[PDB]
Ligand binder design. Structure first.
Ligand SMILES: CCCCCCCCCCCCCCCCCC(=O)OC[C@H](COP(=O)([O-])OCC(O)COP(=O)([O-])OC[C@@H](COC(=O)CCCCCCCCCCCCCCCCC)OC(=O)CCCCCCCCCCCCCCCCC)OC(=O)CCCCCCCCCCCCCCCCC
Ligand SMILES: CCCCCCCCCCCCCCCCC[C@@H](O)O[C@H](CO[C@H](O)CCCCCCCCCCCCCCC)COP(=O)(O)OCC[N+](C)(C)C
Ligand SMILES: CCCCCCCCCCCCCCCCC[C@@H](O)O[C@H](CO[C@H](O)CCCCCCCCCCCCCCC)COP(=O)(O)OCC[N+](C)(C)C
Ligand SMILES: CCCCCCCC/C=C\CCCCCCCC(=O)O[C@H](COC(=O)CCCCCCC/C=C/CCCCCCCC)COP(=O)(O)OCCN
Ligand SMILES: CCCCCCCCCCCC(=O)SCCNC(=O)CCNC(=O)[C@H](O)C(C)(C)COP(=O)(O)O
Lengths: 459, 63, 124, 70, 84, 104, 128, 219, 178, 175, 88, 55
């Protein structure tokens, strides 16, 4: 696994010893090469795992997430190229350094044979993201947003650490393989109830769970484009990966401890979706759509059936790609209008047709159109929930309906209608933005050919 | 002339690939192409066996 | 339908119930009770695999019709005699069903007149 | 594809005899088909098999005995 | 190639209320003491080829004559050919 | 916003709004693509009564038709081999209770 | 005499049926005059800033900014805990959760009891 | 449930169609009523007959819409039947094609719509169904005939009502060929398909005289 | 559309508008031309019975019962012209209307095509550039203090002057650009 | 075609009727089939012969992998992690093989239903019974284990089933 | 569409054609510049009827605020030409 | 062997060729609608054959 870790580290001296005018080219090229190398991780076995060493191991749950993490950096560089043009070379190199550090931390997080190392890197990813939000943010509320994105997370994760070390004092190991092989049931006790809660709420806060989601619209709205992409695409999936990893020890308590959260998710996916119907901001709408999708993922993880887990994995990957592309489209509009308001700039299909096609495809994937992998995940989760209980379908059904509505609402408000008359600075779309949308969307429609690569270890 | 070239590059070439794909690859695997068994009526003769299916019970014909 | 008007407005027990036919013994009418004969055997009537509701006592004529429709295919108007015979057999089956309906109707009529007659004799 | 036909401004439009003969031919073939089918196959509308009268059947065939035997 | 040949309008003296239902309208108005100032404007709707109307049954029976003729000819041919 | 003046020379003709005027708090609910409060030829209560009445009457009459079905003066259809036992469900090793059909 | 039209929330009263416009008074006319005066001032400003050949951007609208700010960021500082807000929040944020909890718990208890009794017919139910 | 839904659908949509002024809306409510009739056919356990009705409705409803579009393009993007007047002679091919389509739609004997809708009605009369569903199916047939009458009368019979500048024109080979192919279809395809497919249901051989013809009387 | 609205509608305007609406809805009710003409003349006769009426209070009592009668008999599906704000083709071609400033973003290879058009366009841009500097001062001097009282604009009064704020009226895209 | 085993995927002898033309009218189907053969099957066949001879020029083999048996979870010490690992891997492979067995039976059932035409409710009773048996076995073996399934959970489920069976049989015997 | 490109001559001829069919106006006295209320002695209701006739003859309806201030046939022709974007 | 499958899949397959060609030069010309109509007519006449086999 060091064949991926070492080049990502070498991305740092390469960036800092580059020309004042060649940092972007060099970073993009070598990030793409690292992604191509990490393509090797996709090959998996039907048996346990790919145990590289005592420190890092890979699985078919870790492999798609690692590939997406490596793939996301070049797109972040391309989108960050534009709004950082007036920045001094040192500060551009600092931005690239933050992105490289975040990629390295995520790569080491998704392998993480041991739970304390996983926790350390899981919480190390907090610093570069915070600096990115609170330093290169346009609005005045970024500082406030940063505080939210910090403390919520820490409030959830400080108990987890305690629980983790406590477990090592009782079992003797936090290594994932031994934790899997030496698992024992949890008795119905108050101590076990609280240990369950401490193990769960840390990952519940980052999905985020409905009622704990308040930090997310702030952090997504006030962050730059690269921050928004990395937050929606990967940093939301850390909680889902952690729940898949840690629930192997929480049985059979999860059989009834999941009730307070399932409801909060099953009703939550309704409320947030409804919130998307009345939203005057594009970024907030996309953030709330992310909340709804991750609520469905939370339900899937809590049901704890093979179909649940396959659907949750597929939905995580698909949602990462789709939300990143939607944020990129909204940013291309914002860089022209400087407003970040849906109703202000209208009728953009007549002015920018190819970008309108990109908008249509992104909304269609967000709408869960078959046979996209979005619908594969949604359908697997819906089947699993129906097996869990026959009434869940009602809630699920409503969410589907609502989703379509706001998705097309977002497409109709901005692309269709009559253009705003007094806006005359809508230049044609650059090759950079078109290539960015193409590189977001083509992997989705290619992954719909080989679903087993994103369906996880229970395939 | 236009319709001659059209039927070659738009009908003839596609049906070659489809027929090649079906008769050598799809039918290489079992149960990929399943045909509803043809109807058998009294008096019919079967090519593989050669035997003759007997006629009926000579129902009383009237009107 | 007129039977609907009679049953839904007159005496409900006066007229028969289609869901519960028949309500009287088959031999209650006369003791001969000749049985129906089915022409096509199981094997051929399965080999032609008509349909589960087309598997009635008229099946042999349908077999003949299918035989011709397969035989004289390009001229789809070659055989009308077999279609006519099958229609005639279905008409006969329908009139037998109508006969059964009216039989149970008038049998119930006679039965009702009976127990009311014994009621009258008992009250006298 | 067609021929040049000019506007008229409050008089009847110019009509080609082609469309007239075509419309007449298709209406005529519709009526000829209806008549031909009615002549050759009239049973589809008027029926072919008679509907029996239930009251016209005698009690001999209906399994009825004169209210005294059974 | 479009319809550009400088079409002419008819002469406005051509439109006379005479021979329409607009006499009936004018008489029923004058029985109360009224006149239609735009009655002459619409006379073109009853003047030219629009002067003759076709009934609903006539419209349905659009090609009954030729069809019936062909039908009887076919029946005669069929009769003369079958009885041979 | 559907009932605003369609002939006024608005700054935003599709939205039917003017630059600088105060915007309704619920604007994004009345945007001509959503709920409109335009007056109707009939009063709201009358439409509600008529529609409700039409639906209730139809459901009631469908229930009545279920209570009083329609049929023809016929007996049940007859099927040859013990009501077609062997090829409807199968189970050939039970020798089911036979039924024979009455020829009339 | 004709049947009267009854306005409602989703079917408002037509302008021609408004008796208020027929109570014409001098202050009503003056109010309409100043209304159209402010409308015309705003339209004049917008057209001056719109027809300018030198302006090559967007015309910043204070009204839209005020609408978005009041809809999003002006809510909480004006929030005051009142019985209306407290009851509405408790209802709309707790009642649905407990209702769905009761529904799902009842359904799953029934299903589990049927499974333990063994009378459920889960045949062919392989994938879960 | 399927039978009741189909019956209420066909009745309500025909009742809405009976008084519409947009031609496209009239034909849309017509096709909605035909779909309701298909659902009624499904409800009385007659699937292949419903498929056959689907196949016939394809032909004649597609041709009806094409004729409607021909008129709409001819009268400069006009759809309201209050402004189509005398078109029986103004455009003859559209007139005869739409007449044939309305005859097929109403089940005129020995056309494409006969071989499906007549059997639909015969099957619904002699099946153990709701009385209400049968009643509303009959009323739907009557209303189908009535809105076909409305189209014919309001668009082809009276005096013209369109703007003075007459732009009526039919002589395009594309339009004529496209209409005539479905004309031949909606005439002969009913017979051809009905006589080529193998028998897939027991026939309704014997009927009361009034019950056999009831569709014709209603129409 | 073209005319700026006034502060209010006088009684004359309201009566004329009601008369036109009633005639239109009567035309909708009476499809045929002769019947419409008869009933339109009858409506005109019923309409001018009170033409020479004098006092305002009873005239305003009228036109109110008339409006109630119209709202009772308004034909809930009136005829609408295809391009009218309710018609079947009201905004059909609004997706084909492209602003003129888009042409400034064309590539030089695109502007190599159509060169005479772009020469004329440059002439138009120069004319606008000078005329705007004149128009701003004309509007500043002609405007009553305290802001305009109506949204009606004054014409050009000199030789070389052009009407104030003319660029976005003369450069409408088209009625049917494609 | 030898590409698959005929015993695993049984197919009836496929008896077909012979043409009995009752009219002298030439049909279009035979002519269409003849021209289809001449125009499509022959070029495809020649291309296949060319490709097949090219493949025969370079012939090489690949092999199926055999797996030895190892002690299963029932004969592994409580905390001995190596034997637990081996038993777990063996159990996972057996689970995959069982899944494929159910797949094979389901394919048999589907092929029977399609082939039998309208008499499927009768002529596929053997396949339906065989699928019922395989489904019952698979459901007993693997259902309700969960997402974090293992050999230990399967063993515990089997043990609970065996306790229930033993108790019920003992109660029935002494009644 | 296939609609001819109507010109100012066509619009003027059509407007005068419709006005001549108005028996309330004698045809010899009306001109293109002839006012309606003063030169032709017409009421306001006659003006709104003339506007309605223009609407029905041209196929588009003029907003009332613009209709009530159309007082010459030349003004009606100019308004229609401005609406329909007529060159010559 | 058995042209039924080959033809009934070929009709659906050839129905998609113009979508493949939508990025070609013919899409930028006025011959595209005629191309699509011709493709649909050819697909229909090819689909008529399995209908004959079924009949
Ligand atoms: C995760 C999913 C989402 C979850 C989160 C979202 C949803 C769940 C959480 C959010 C909802 C939580 C709300 C909790 C309630 C908060 C109450 C609060 O903070 O009040 C302080 C707030 C400050 O006090 P204050 O400013 O000194 O009083 C001024 C009042 O206007 C003066 O008013 P007053 O004194 O005339 O009235 C008070 C009096 C009268 O009360 C009433 O008016 C009606 C009765 C209401 C309660 C009993 C029914 O009290 C009572 O009689 C009832 C007491 C119970 O007082 C209130 O405004 C509320 C008073 C009554 C609240 C009752 C709420 C009951 C809800 C069900 C439990
Ligand atoms: C607009 C103009 C178009 C003109 C062109 C028209 C041409 C028509 C073709 C268009 C699509 C039709 C699809 C037809 C299928 C052909 C391809 C398919 O057969 O290959 C698939 C195989 O493709 C791959 O499985 C899918 C590609 C995987 C995509 C991974 C992306 C790699 C880098 C992207 C970055 C990662 C970001 C996302 C993180 C997870 C499935 O093959 P399969 O039958 O199964 O077995 C493979 C061969 N075997 C038998 C030897 C085993
Ligand atoms: C606000 C946004 C959402 C954030 C996250 C919300 C999700 C957190 C929910 C926590 C999970 C539920 C808590 C405990 C569940 C166990 C079930 C138990 O509590 O219920 C009964 C127990 O009854 C009562 O629950 C006893 C405790 C009552 C006190 C609990 C506080 C209730 C309201 C407080 C809400 C505060 C939550 C939010 C904090 C910020 C069971 O009956 P019993 O057989 O006896 O107990 C069995 C367990 N034994 C064997 C160990 C004894
Ligand atoms: C953004 C907000 C999110 C905040 C989430 C924080 C809540 C996490 C849940 C509680 C945190 C502490 C749990 C304890 C950590 C695990 C330790 C453990 O597992 O051992 C337990 C430890 O048990 C405890 O210490 C429990 C004490 C809890 C004190 C603090 C309570 C805080 C409030 C809890 C109620 C709220 C629950 C839901 C919170 C949702 C988040 C909003 C057993 O005790 P032993 O000593 O080992 O006994 C063995 C011999 N019999
Ligand atoms: C189908 C829908 C149903 C129909 C409902 C219609 C109901 C209408 C009944 C009421 C009739 C009326 O006018 S209601 C009577 C309202 N009051 C008056 O008419 C008094 C003064 N009239 C004026 O001043 C006008 O301008 C005038 C002189 C008319 C023109 O003038 P010009 O032209 O010189 O400008």
């Amino acid at each position: 696994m060091l064949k991926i870790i070492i080049p990502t580290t070498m991305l740092l001296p390469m960036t800092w010893m580059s020309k004042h005018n060649m940092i972007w080219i060099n970073a993009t090229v070598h990030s793409l090469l690292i992604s191509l190398i990490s393509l090797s991780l996709l090959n998996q076995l039907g048996e346990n795992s790919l145990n590289f060493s005592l420190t890092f191991f890979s699985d078919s749950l870790s492999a798609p997430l690692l590939v997406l993490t490596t793939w996301l950096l070049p797109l972040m560089l391309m989108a960050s190229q534009s709004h950082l043009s007036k920045e001094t070379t040192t500060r551009k190199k600092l931005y690239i350094t933050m992105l490289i550090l975040l990629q390295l931390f995520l790569i080491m997080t998704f392998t993480a044979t041991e739970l304390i190392l996983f926790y350390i890197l899981f919480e190390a990813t907090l610093v570069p993201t915070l600096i990115i939000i609170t330093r290169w943010g346009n609005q005045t509320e970024r500082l406030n947003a940063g505080l939210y994105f910090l403390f919520y997370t820490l409030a959830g994760s400080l108990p987890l650490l305690v629980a983790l070390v406590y477990i090592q004092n009782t079992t003797g190991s936090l290594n994932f393989l031994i934790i899997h092989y030496w698992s024992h049931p949890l008795s119905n006790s108050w101590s076990n109830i609280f240990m369950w809660l401490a193990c769960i709420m840390a990952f519940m806060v980052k999905m985020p769970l409905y009622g704990l989601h308040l930090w997310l619209p702030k952090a997504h709205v006030e962050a730059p484009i690269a921050g928004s992409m990395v937050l929606a695409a990967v940093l939301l999936k850390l909680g889902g990966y952690g729940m898949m990893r840690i629930t192997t020890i929480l049985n059979p308590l999860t059989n009834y401890m999941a009730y307070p959260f399932l409801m909060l998710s099953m009703w939550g996916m309704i409320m947030t979706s409804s919130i998307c119907l009345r939203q005057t901001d594009l970024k907030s709408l996309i953030a709330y759509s992310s909340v709804s999708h991750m609520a469905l993922v939370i339900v899937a993880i809590m049901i704890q059936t093979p179909w649940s887990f396959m659907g949750a994995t597929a939905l995580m990957i698909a949602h990462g790609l789709t939300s990143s592309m939607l944020f990129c489209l909204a940013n291309t509009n914002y860089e022209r209008v400087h407003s970040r308001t849906m109703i202000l700039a209208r009728g953009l299909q007549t002015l920018l047709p190819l970008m309108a096609t990109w908008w249509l495809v992104a909304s269609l994937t967000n709408l869960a159109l078959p046979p996209s992998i979005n619908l594969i995940g949604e359908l697997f989760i819906i089947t699993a929930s129906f097996s869990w209980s026959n009434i869940t379908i009602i809630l699920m059904g409503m969410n589907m309906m609502i989703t379509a509505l706001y998705s097309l609402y977002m497409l109709i408000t901005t692309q269709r209608g009559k253009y705003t008359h007094h806006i005359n600075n809508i230049k044609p779309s650059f090759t950079r933005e078109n290539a960015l949308m193409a590189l977001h969307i083509l992997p989705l429609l290619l992954l719909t050919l080989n679903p087993k690569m994103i369906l996880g270890p229970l395939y | 002339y236009r319709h001659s070239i059209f039927a070659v590059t738009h009908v003839l070439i596609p049906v070659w690939i489809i027929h090649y794909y079906l008769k050598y690859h799809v039918t290489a695997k079992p149960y990929t192409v399943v045909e509803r068994k043809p109807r058998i009526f009294p008096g019919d003769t079967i090519l593989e066996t050669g035997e003759v299916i007997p006629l009926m019970k000579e129902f009383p014909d009237q009107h | 339908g007129a039977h609907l008007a009679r049953r839904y407005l007159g005496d409900a027990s006066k007229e028969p119930d289609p869901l519960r036919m028949p309500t009287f013994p088959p031999d209650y009418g006369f003791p001969e009770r000749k049985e129906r004969e089915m022409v096509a055997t199981q094997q051929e009537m399965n080999d032609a695999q008509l349909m589960l509701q087309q598997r009635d006592y008229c099946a042999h004529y349908l077999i003949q019709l299918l035989k011709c429709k397969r035989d004289s295919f390009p001229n789809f108007l070659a055989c009308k005699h077999e279609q006519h015979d099958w229609d005639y057999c279905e008409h006969l089956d329908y009139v037998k069903r109508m006969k059964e309906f009216e039989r149970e109707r008038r049998l119930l009529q006679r039965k009702k007149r009976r127990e009311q007659r014994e009621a009258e004799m008992a009250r006298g | 594809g067609g021929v040049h036909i000019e506007p008229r401004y409050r008089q009847f439009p110019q009509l080609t005899r082609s469309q007239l003969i075509q419309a007449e031919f298709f209406s005529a073939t519709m009526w000829f088909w209806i008549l031909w089918r009615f002549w050759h196959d009239s049973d589809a509308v008027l029926g072919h098999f008679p509907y029996p009268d239930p009251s016209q059947w005698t009690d001999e065939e209906l399994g009825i005995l004169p209210d005294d035997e059974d | 190639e479009h319809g550009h040949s400088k079409m002419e309008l008819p002469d406005y003296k051509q439109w006379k209320i005479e021979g329409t239902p607009l006499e009936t309208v004018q008489e029923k108005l004058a029985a109360r003491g009224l006149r239609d100032p735009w009655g002459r404007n619409e006379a073109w709707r009853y003047s030219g080829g629009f002067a003759n109307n076709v009934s609903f049954v006539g419209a349905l029976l659009k090609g009954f004559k030729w069809g019936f003729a062909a039908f009887v000819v076919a029946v005669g041919a069929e009769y003369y050919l079958e009885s041979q | 916003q559907q009932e605003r003046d369609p002939w006024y020379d608005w700054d935003h003709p599709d939205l039917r709004l003017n630059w600088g005027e105060p915007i309704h708090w619920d604007l994004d609910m009345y945007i001509r693509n959503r709920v409109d409060t335009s007056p109707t030829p009939v009063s709201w209560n009358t439409m509600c009564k008529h529609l409700f009445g039409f639906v209730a009457f139809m459901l009631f009459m469908f229930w009545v038709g279920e209570i009083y079905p329609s049929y023809q003066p016929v007996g049940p259809k007859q099927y040859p081999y013990n009501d077609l036992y062997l090829e409807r469900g199968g189970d050939p090793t039970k020798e089911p209770e036979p039924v024979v059909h009455y020829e009339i | 005499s004709f049947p009267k039209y009854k306005p409602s929330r989703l079917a408002t009263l037509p302008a021609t049926l408004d008796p208020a416009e027929y109570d014409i008074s001098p202050e009503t006319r003056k109010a309409q005059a100043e209304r159209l005066a402010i409308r015309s001032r705003l339209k004049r400003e917008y057209l001056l800033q719109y027809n300018d050949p030198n302006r090559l951007g967007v015309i910043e609208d204070p009204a839209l900014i005020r609408w978005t700010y009041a809809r999003s960021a002006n809510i909480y500082p004006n929030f005051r805990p009142t019985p209306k807000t407290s009851l509405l929040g408790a209802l709309f944020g707790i009642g649905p959760l407990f209702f769905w909890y009761y529904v799902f718990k009842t359904d799953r208890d029934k299903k589990e009891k049927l499974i333990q009794e063994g009378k459920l017919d889960q045949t062919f139910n392989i994938s879960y | 449930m399927t039978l009741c839904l189909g019956a209420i659908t066909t009745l309500f949509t025909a009742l809405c169609a009976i008084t519409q002024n947009d031609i496209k809306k009239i034909v849309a409510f017509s096709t909605s009523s035909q779909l309701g009739l298909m659902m009624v056919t499904i409800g009385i356990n007659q699937p292949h007959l419903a498929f056959l009705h689907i196949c016939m409705h394809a032909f004649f409803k597609a041709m009806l819409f094409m004729c409607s579009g021909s008129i709409i393009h001819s009268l400069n993007d006009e759809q309201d039947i209050r402004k189509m007047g005398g078109l029986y002679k103004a455009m003859p091919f559209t007139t005869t094609a739409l007449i044939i389509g309305s005859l097929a739609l109403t089940g005129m004997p020995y056309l494409t719509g006969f071989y499906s809708k007549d059997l639909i009605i015969e099957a619904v009369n002699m099946s153990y169904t709701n009385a209400w569903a049968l009643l509303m199916t009959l009323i739907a047939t009557s209303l189908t005939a009535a809105y076909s009458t409305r189209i014919i009368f309001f668009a082809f019979l009276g005096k013209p009502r369109f703007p003075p500048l007459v732009l009526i024109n039919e002589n395009n080979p594309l339009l004529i060929n496209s209409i005539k192919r479905l004309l031949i279809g909606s005439i002969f395809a009913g017979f051809i398909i009905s006589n080529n497919i193998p028998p897939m249901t027991v026939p309704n051989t014997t009927m009361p005289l009034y019950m056999k013809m009831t569709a014709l009387i209603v129409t | 559309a073209f005319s700026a609205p006034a502060a209010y509608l006088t009684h004359q305007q309201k009566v004329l508008r009601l008369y036109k609406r009633a005639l239109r809805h009567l035309e909708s009710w009476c499809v045929h031309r002769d019947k419409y003409r008869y009933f339109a003349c009858l409506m005109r006769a019923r309409f001018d019975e009170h033409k020479n009426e004098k006092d305002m209070v009873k005239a305003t009592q009228l036109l109110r019962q008339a409006e109630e009668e119209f709202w009772y008999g308004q034909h809930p599906q009136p005829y609408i012209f295809p391009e009218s704000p309710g018609g079947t083709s009201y905004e059909r071609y609004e997706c084909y209307k492209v602003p003129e400033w888009c042409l400034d973003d064309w590539h030089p290879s695109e502007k190599a095509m159509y060169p005479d058009y772009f020469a004329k366009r440059e002439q138009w841009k120069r004319l606008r550039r000078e005329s705007w500097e004149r128009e701003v001062k004309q509007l500043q001097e002609e405007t009553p203090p305290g802001g305009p009282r109506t949204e009606a604009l004054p014409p050009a009064r000199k030789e070389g002057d052009l009407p104030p704020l003319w660029w976005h009226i003369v450069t409408r895209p088209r009625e049917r650009p494609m | 075609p030898d590409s698959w085993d005929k015993d695993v995927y049984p197919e009836p002898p496929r008896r077909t009727p012979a043409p009995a033309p009752q009219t002298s009218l030439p049909n279009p189907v035979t002519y269409l089939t003849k021209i289809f053969d001449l125009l499509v099957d022959r070029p495809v066949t020649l291309a296949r012969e060319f490709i097949e001879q090219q493949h025969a020029k370079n012939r090489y083999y690949y092999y199926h992998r055999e797996f030895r048996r190892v002690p299963d979870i029932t004969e592994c010490e409580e905390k001995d992690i190596l034997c637990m690992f081996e038993a777990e891997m063996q159990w996972r492979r057996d689970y995959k093989v069982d899944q494929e067995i159910v797949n094979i039976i389901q394919e048999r059932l589907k092929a029977c239903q399609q082939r039998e035409g309208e008499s499927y409710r009768q002529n596929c009773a053997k396949e339906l019974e065989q699928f019922t048996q395989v489904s019952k076995a698979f459901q007993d073996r693997y259902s309700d284990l969960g997402a974090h399934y293992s050999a230990r959970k399967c063993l515990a489920k089997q043990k609970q089933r065996m306790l229930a069976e033993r108790k019920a049989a003992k109660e029935a015997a002494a009644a | 569409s296939d609609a001819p490109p109507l010109t100012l001559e066509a619009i003027k001829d059509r407007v005068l054609y419709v006005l001549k069919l108005y028996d309330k106006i004698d045809p010899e006295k009306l001109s293109v510049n002839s006012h309606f209320m003063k030169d032709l002695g017409l009421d306001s209701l006659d003006q709104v009827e003339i506007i309605m006739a223009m609407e029905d003859e041209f196929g588009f309806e003029i907003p009332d605020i613009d209709a009530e201030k159309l007082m010459c046939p030349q003004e009606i022709v100019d308004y229609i030409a401005d609406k329909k974007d007529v060159y010559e | 062997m058995n042209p039924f499958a080959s033809l009934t899949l070929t009709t659906l397959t050839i129905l998609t060729i113009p979508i493949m060609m939508s990025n070609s030069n013919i899409y930028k010309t006025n011959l595209y609608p005629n191309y699509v109509k011709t493709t649909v007519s050819y697909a229909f006449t090819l689909s008529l054959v399995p209908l004959l086999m079924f009949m």
